[PDB]
Ligand binder design. Structure first.
Ligand SMILES: CCC(=O)N1CCN2c3c(cnc4cc(-c5c(C)ccc6n[nH]cc56)c(Cl)cc34)OC[C@H]2C1
Ligand SMILES: Nc1nc2c(ncn2[C@@H]2O[C@H](COP(=O)(O)OP(=O)(O)O)[C@@H](O)[C@H]2O)c(=O)[nH]1
Ligand SMILES: [Mg+2]
Length: 168
């Protein structure tokens, strides 16, 4: 039948990993979503005429290492590294998430997409050029997104699925 793509969404607390995922799946913006809930969500989509089942792990809880998390990253086929465009700290943190994923995959060609979320906000502290330059250095696409307006949301996840396809 149809292909499954195991996607993992990573990034600092409060960048809108949950909000991106609920927007994608349910078409609503959640103004407040339990910061602690870490769960996988499944949704069937059409991408370039191919029917695709996405299984999306939305990370949350606490800053702690677990062999369970290593297992989710190990099974994960592709990653969305999410920061918020009004939060330089979340941008500085991208490095750390990407390093942990590489730690477990023990490899360099892992499908990933850099995502600058909350693009609906006027109060930017990370310029597009900076994020572009980072994504160039990582060898991965950059997509600006807004969970609130939906701008870029389908593009982000579809781009990651195409990145997984290009690798497989
Ligand atoms: C509002 C709360 C929130 O959103 N979070 C999401 C992120 N979470 C994390 C951090 C910092 N480092 C993290 C590292 C890993 C992680 C990766 C990426 C890969 C392999 C791993 N093995 N064990 C842990 C691993 C993960 Cl899943 C989560 C982290 O700070 C905030 C906290 C809670
Ligand atoms: N303006 C705006 N707010 C957002 C957006 N994405 C998430 N938020 C808000 O930022 C907060 C954190 O979002 P959440 O999805 O819980 O962050 P997570 O901790 O990364 O799961 C919530 O109050 C969300 O409404 C966005 O694209 N634009
Ligand atoms: Mg969340």
């Amino acid at each position: 039948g149809m292909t499954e793509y195991k996607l993992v969404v990573v990034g600092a607390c409060g960048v809108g990993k949950s909000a991106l995922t609920i927007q994608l799946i349910q078409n609503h913006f959640v103004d407040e979503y339990d910061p602690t809930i870490e769960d996988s969500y499944r949704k069937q989509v059409v991408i370039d005429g191919e029917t695709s089942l996405l299984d999306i792990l939305d990370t949350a809880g606490q800053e702690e290492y677990s062999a369970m998390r290593d297992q989710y990253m190990r099974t994960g086929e592709g990653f969305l590294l999410v920061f918020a465009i009004n939060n330089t700290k979340s941008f500085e943190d991208i490095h750390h998430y990407r390093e942990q994923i590489k730690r477990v995959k023990d490899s360099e060609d892992v499908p990933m997409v850099l995502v600058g979320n909350k693009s609906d906000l006027p109060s930017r502290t990370v310029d597009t050029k900076q994020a572009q330059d980072l994504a160039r250095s990582y060898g991965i696409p950059f997509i600006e997104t807004s969970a609130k307006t939906r701008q870029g949301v389908d593009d982000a996840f579809y781009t990651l699925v195409r990145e997984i396809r290009k690798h497989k």
